[PDB]
């Protein structure tokens, strides 16, 4: 099975840098985009970049030029993130994630590295952010796109140990294993996760990630909770 597998604990002293590692396995670590995710403590994520490691060919976030550099070693299929002059606040927990054929675009994900330091871009409205239901029940999660983002929508879950899990590609392709009471649509500006049929391990968080556009963006999370 695919597995990208990240680096440890990097606790470190300002200005110093670090270069956090995802090593991957189970499949063909060339043949596919890798992205790296910023999530600060309590935050929705942020898009860094991407590089294919085809050709060396890295795309930034224009905030995170100067900050994170991006490589791969194709001898030992481990991609790279180096955090350069670190502060305050680059302390977070840094995601790599791959893509698969398009338009299924960022859909594995490693399981999160923190970093702590101690001594025009489409906006995606997600609402609501918080959202109390019983076992059972049928609730609609929903992101608004700040401008037309086509069917380059996903729905992403996150645990609350940090781990990532694409359920929902091109706005309504179901991930394999995914239950089918998950289901996501369309309908103008409106993106929505139905989650029918509540079960108790559905009650975590959710974003959505739009990747029609550089910089991929994402909404700002729904935290899901029992009544």
């Known amino acids: 099975q695919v597995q990208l597998q990240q680096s440890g604990l990097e606790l470190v002293k300002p200005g110093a840098s670090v270069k956090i590692s995802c090593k991957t396995s189970?499949?063909?670590?060339?043949?596919?985009?890798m992205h790296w995710v910023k999530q600060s403590h309590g935050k929705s994520l942020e898009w860094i970049g991407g590089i294919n490691p085809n050709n060396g060919g890295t795309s930034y976030n224009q905030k995170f030029k100067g900050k994170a550099i991006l490589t791969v070693d194709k001898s030992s299929s481990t991609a790279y993130l180096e955090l350069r002059s670190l502060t305050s606040e680059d302390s977070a927990v840094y995601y790599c994630?791959?893509?698969?054929?398009?338009?299924?675009?960022?859909?594995?994900w490693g399981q999160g590295t923190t970093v702590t330091v101690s001594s025009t871009d489409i906006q995606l409205t997600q609402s609501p952010s918080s959202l109390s239901a019983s076992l059972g029940e049928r609730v609609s999660i929903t992101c608004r796109a700040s401008?037309?983002?086509?069917?380059?929508l996903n729905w992403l879950q996150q645990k609350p140990d940090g781990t990532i899990k694409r359920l929902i590609y091109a706005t309504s392709s179901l991930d394999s294993g995914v239950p089918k009471r998950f289901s996501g649509s369309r309908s103008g500006s409106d993106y929505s996760l139905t989650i029918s049929s509540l079960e108790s391990e559905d009650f975590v968080d959710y974003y959505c990630l739009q990747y029609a556009s550089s910089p991929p963006t994402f909404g700002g999370g729904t935290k899901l909770e029992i009544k």
């Open positions: 994630a791959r893509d698969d054929r398009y338009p299924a675009w960022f859909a594995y």
């Open positions: 189970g499949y063909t670590f060339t043949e596919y985009t």
């Open positions: 401008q037309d983002i086509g069917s380059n």
